[PDB]
Design a protein around this ligand. Structure first.
Ligand SMILES: Nc1ncnc2c1ncn2[C@@H]1O[C@H](COP(=O)(O)OP(=O)(O)OP(=O)(O)O)[C@@H](O)[C@H]1O
Ligand SMILES: C/C1=C/C(=O)O[C@@H]2C[C@@H](CC[C@H](C)/C=C\CC1)O[C@@](O)([C@@H]1CSC(=O)N1)C2
Ligand SMILES: [Mg+2]
Lengths: 359, 216
C-alpha cells in the first residue's frame, strides 16, 4: 500500500515512507564486524569491531556489508516487513551495470519486496524543485556530481564527477587547524572537526577580499567547546575549508572547481538547451549547505557564461534531503504505479530487468 | 509542494521516450556502454583505444601479479577511471590515482561487460554454442569460420584481447592463472544470449588453446 524510499549515501542513510515530507530515519552508513553491528550501534562498539564504509564515493563496494545496511533499515530503523512495501532506492549517475543488477537481486531474493525501483539521485533532486529539466550540483559526503538533465534524462556524456566532497573538506579542516596547535588525527577526533565544519564554516563571496578583511574583522573568529570542556577558536579556516570546492588545488587536486565543472558540463550539452540549464541550477546534498555557496556560485558562473545569459541558482533550505524528498514524491504518484519492477516480473527476467525498467 | 506533485503527476505520462531524446542528439554514447562498432568508427580504428591501453599497461606491469584478472579492483576507483576515459582527458594508467593493477584489469573486464552487445555478437551466440557442442575434431574449424563472419571491430578486438590473455597464461607459473581460471572470468562476459555458462567458458578455453589456427 505505502512504499518505502531509501537514499543510500556514502556517509548517511536516509529512509522512510513515501508521501512524507522528511525521512523517518537518518543514520550513518557504517558496518562493524568483530576483530555484526551497523549504524550508530557499530560506532559505540568501535573497539570491538573494525568499521567499514560499504559505499565509497557513491558506489557500493562491499555488498556483504551493504546487505546488512538494508536489513537494519527495514527491521530496526523503519520496523516494517519488506515483503509488504514497494521499495524505491537511489543510485549515482552511470552506476556500473553489475551494481544495478546486484541491488535488484538482493532486494527481491533476500528481502522479498513486492516491487522495487531505482532512480538517479540527481534526478530526484531536480524533481523535488518542481522541475524536469536543469543541471544539478549534487555534493554529499563521498562524491560530487554535475548532472545536466533533460525531461528526466541525465545526459551521460556531460556528467561531471569529482572525488572531492564533504569528507575531504573535513580532512582539510583537520589539516589547516594544525596552524592553531590543534591535533585532530583519529577517527573520533575527525567527528569533532566535521561538527565544527557544519556549524561554523561558510563560503566567501570574494575569497581574496575576505582574506584582507580577516585580520581587520571583529566577527570572524568563533569559539567551539570540545566534549571534554576545552574551548578552541577558529578564524579564517571557516571559509578556507569550503574554498577547496572552488580551488581544489588546496588539497593537491588538479581538477577544476565546482563552478568550472558546472560550466564545462553545460557547454557539453546541445546549444538549444544551454539557456534552460543556465537558468535552472539546482543544488542538493549536505556539502551544498554552506552559507553563501549559492551567491558564490551565481557569481562564478556569470563570470564564465556569456554576458547575455540569465543565470539562477536554486538552493532550497531542505536540500540536505532533496534526493529523498524527490523519491518520496515520485513513489507516491498514481502515475508511477506501472513503472515499478514487480516481483512477478523479476522471477521471470532476473536482475537484468533493471536496465529496461529504470531510466 | 501541491503544484510540483501535480506537474510531476502529468509529466510521468507525457515524458518523451529515451529514443526520442537521442533523435534530437541530446544523449551521446561514450566509451563505456556504447556500441563497439560505433566506438571504433568515432576513433578511426578497429580496436577501442582504452582496450589497447589496458593491455599494454598490464603486459608491462602486471604480468607477474598473482591472480590477475581474478582479483577484483576497487569499484570506486574504477568508476573514476570510467569518467577519466569517457572524457578523453590526459590519462596515464601508471599514475598513483589508479592504485594497483587490479583496477586496470577490472576496468578492462567491465568494458566488455558494459557492451550493449557481447563481443561475440548476439546473432552468432547460437552458432558458437552449437560449434562447441560438435565432435571435438571439428570444433576448431567451426569456431574459426564463425569468427571470420563477425564484423571487423569484433574480429580485431577479439584477437588483441585473446593474444593478451594467452601471454597471461604463458606466465602462469608466476601469476597462477590457467586456461580454466581465465575462461571462468571472461566466459559469461564475452558470450551472452539475448533471450549455458559451461559452454561459454569452453569457447574461450578453445580459442585461447588453439590461438594460432583460429586467427589464421
Ligand atoms: N550545514 C552543513 N554545512 C556544510 N556541510 C554539511 C552540513 N550538513 C552536513 N554537511 C556535510 O554533508 C555530508 C553528508 O551529506 P549527505 O548525507 O547528503 O551525503 P551522502 O548522500 O551520504 O553522500 P554521497 O551523496 O556522496 O553518497 C557530511 O559529510 C557533512 O559533513
Ligand atoms: C552525526 C553523524 C553525522 C554524519 O553525517 O557523519 C557521516 C557518517 C559518518 C560515519 C561514522 C561516524 C563516526 C558515525 C556517525 C556520525 C553520524 O562518517 C562521516 O562523519 C564522514 C567522516 S568525517 C566526515 O566529514 N564525514 C559522515
Ligand atoms: Mg547522496
Amino acid at each position: 500500500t505505502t512504499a518505502l524510499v531509501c537514499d543510500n549515501g556514502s556517509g548517511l542513510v536516509k529512509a522512510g515512507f513515501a508521501g512524507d515530507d522528511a525521512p523517518r530515519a537518518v543514520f550513518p552508513s557504517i558496518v562493524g564486524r568483530p576483530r555484526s553491528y551497523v549504524g550508530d550501534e557499530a560506532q559505540s562498539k568501535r573497539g570491538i569491531l573494525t568499521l567499514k564504509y560499504p559505499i565509497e564515493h557513491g558506489i557500493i563496494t562491499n555488498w556483504d556489508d551493504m546487505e546488512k545496511i538494508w536489513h537494519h533499515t527495514f527491521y530496526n530503523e523503519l520496523r516494517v516487513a519488506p515483503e509488504e512495501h514497494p521499495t524505491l532506492l537511489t543510485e549515482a549517475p552511470l552506476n556500473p551495470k553489475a551494481n544495478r543488477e546486484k541491488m535488484t537481486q538482493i532486494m527481491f531474493e533476500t528481502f522479498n519486496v513486492p516491487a522495487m525501483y531505482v532512480a538517479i539521485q540527481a534526478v530526484l533532486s531536480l524533481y523535488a524543485s518542481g522541475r524536469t529539466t536543469g543541471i544539478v550540483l549534487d555534493s554529499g559526503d563521498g562524491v560530487t556530481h554535475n548532472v545536466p538533465i533533460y525531461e528526466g534524462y541525465a545526459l551521460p556524456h556531460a556528467i561531471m564527477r569529482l572525488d572531492l566532497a564533504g569528507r575531504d573538506l573535513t580532512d582539510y579542516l583537520m589539516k589547516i587547524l594544525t596552524e592553531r596547535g590543534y591535533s585532530f588525527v583519529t577517527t573520533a577526533e575527525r567527528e569533532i572537526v566535521r561538527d565544527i565544519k557544519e556549524k561554523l564554516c561558510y563560503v566567501a563571496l570574494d575569497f581574496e577580499n575576505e582574506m584582507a578583511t580577516a585580520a581587520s574583522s571583529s566577527s570572524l573568529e568563533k569559539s567551539y567547546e570540545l566534549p571534554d570542556g576545552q574551548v578552541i577558536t577558529i578564524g579564517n579556516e571557516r571559509f578556507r575549508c569550503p574554498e577547496t570546492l572552488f580551488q581544489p588545488s588546496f588539497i593537491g587536486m588538479e581538477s577544476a572547481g565546482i563552478h568550472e565543472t558546472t560550466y564545462n558540463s553545460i557547454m557539453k550539452c546541445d546549444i538549444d538547451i544551454r539557456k534552460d540549464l543556465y537558468a535552472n541550477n539546482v543544488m542538493s546534498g549536505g556539502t551544498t549547505m554552506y552559507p553563501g555557496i549559492a551567491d558564490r556560485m551565481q557569481k562564478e558562473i556569470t563570470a564564465l557564461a556569456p554576458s547575455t545569459m540569465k543565470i539562477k541558482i536554486i538552493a532550497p533550505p531542505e536540500r540536505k534531503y532533496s534526493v529523498w524528498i524527490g523519491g518520496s514524491i515520485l513513489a507516491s504518484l498514481s502515475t508511477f504505479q506501472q513503472m515499478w519492477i514487480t516481483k512477478q516480473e523479476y522471477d521471470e527476467a532476473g536482475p537484468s530487468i533493471v536496465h529496461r525498467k529504470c531510466f | 509542494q501541491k503544484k510540483t506533485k501535480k506537474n510531476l503527476k502529468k509529466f510521468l505520462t507525457r515524458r518523451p521516450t529515451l529514443q526520442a531524446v537521442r533523435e534530437k542528439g541530446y544523449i551521446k554514447d561514450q566509451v563505456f556502454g556504447s556500441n563497439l562498432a560505433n566506438l571504433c568508427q568515432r576513433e578511426n580504428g578497429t580496436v577501442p583505444k582504452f582496450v589497447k591501453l589496458c593491455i599494454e599497461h598490464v603486459e608491462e606491469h602486471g604480468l607477474d601479479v598473482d591472480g590477475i584478472y581474478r582479483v577484483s579492483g576497487n569499484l570506486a576507483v574504477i568508476q573514476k577511471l570510467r569518467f577519466a576515459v569517457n572524457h578523453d582527458e590526459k590519462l596515464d594508467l601508471n599514475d598513483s590515482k589508479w592504485e594497483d593493477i587490479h583496477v586496470i584489469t577490472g576496468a578492462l573486464k567491465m568494458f566488455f561487460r558494459e557492451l550493449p552487445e557481447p563481443l561475440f555478437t548476439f546473432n552468432h551466440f547460437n552458432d558458437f554454442v552449437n560449434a562447441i557442442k560438435q565432435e571435438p575434431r571439428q570444433r576448431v574449424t567451426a569456431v574459426k569460420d564463425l569468427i571470420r563472419q563477425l564484423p571487423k571491430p569484433n574480429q580485431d578486438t577479439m584477437q588483441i584481447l585473446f593474444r593478451h590473455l594467452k601471454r597471461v597464461i604463458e606466465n602462469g607459473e608466476k601469476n597462477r592463472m590457467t586456461y580454466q581460471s581465465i575462461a571462468i572470468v571472461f566466459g559469461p562476459t564475452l558470450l551472452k544470449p539475448e533471450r549455458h555458462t559451461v559452454y561459454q567458458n569452453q569457447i574461450v578455453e578453445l580459442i585461447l588453446l588453439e590461438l594460432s589456427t583460429v586467427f589464421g
